[PDB]
Amino acid sequence: TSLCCKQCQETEITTKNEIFSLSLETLTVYKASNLNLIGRPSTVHSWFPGYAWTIAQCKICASHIGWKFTATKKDMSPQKFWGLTRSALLP
Ligand SMILES: O=C1CC[C@H](N2C(=O)c3ccccc3C2=O)C(=O)N1
Ligand SMILES: [Zn+2]
């Protein structure tokens, strides 16, 4: 169930336990680890209306794994989640 950065191999980014389905490839998970955020949130072209995105890269190898999505309104659930490019992860 560990999902690790495919590039550096050793760095766990999330687990299968964290996977969920947002009502509307890209894996969406409630929680992730060992990612650094680059820049500030943007709503431009957001794949999840009502959320803004921030680039998220592996803390070890700087590979771009996906994005942190943050809610633009307080009344939403989850207030944030991660959308991760499946091919960037092992398994
Ligand atoms: O929700 C998202 C995440 C970011 C993603 N995105 C990209 O992957 C990209 C590549 C090049 C130029 C502009 C973009 C962009 O907005 C995108 O289109 N929407
Ligand atoms: Zn890595």
Pocket of ligand 1 (CB under 6 A): 44-47, 53, 67
* Smallest CA separation from ligand 1 atom 14, residue: 45
What are the tokens at 45?
């072209």
Total domain count for the chain?
1
Contact 20, 81 (CB under 8 A): yes
What is the rounded distance in angstroms from the CA atom of residue 50 to the CA atom of residue 57? 22
Report the structure determination method: X-ray
Q: How many CB atoms lie within 10 A of CB 34?
A: 18
Asked whether residue 61 is marked as a ligand-binding residue, the answer is yes
Domain span at residue 36?
A: 1-91
Nearest-CA residue for atom 10 of ligand 1? 45
* Rg of the chain in Å (alpha carbons): 13
- Burial string for 46-67 (b: 16+ CB within 10 Å, else e) reads bebeebbbbebbbeeeeeebbb
d(CA 13, CA 24): 24
3-state secondary structure the chain: CEEEECCCCCCEEEEHHHECCCCCCEEEECCCCCEEEEEEEECCCCCCCCEEEEEEEECCCCCEEEEEEEECCCCCCCCEEEEEEHHHEEC
Q: b vs e for 11-32, b when ≥16 Cβ sit within 10 Å of the residue's Cβ?
A: bebbeeebeeeeeeeebbbeeb
CATH number at residue 12: 2.170.150.20
Pocket test for ligand 1, best of 45, 55, 82 (most atoms within 8 A of CB): 45
Residues in the chain: 91
CA distance linking residue 61 with residue 17, whole number of Å = 24
> For residues 47 and 13, what is the distance between their CA atoms, to the nearest angstrom?
21
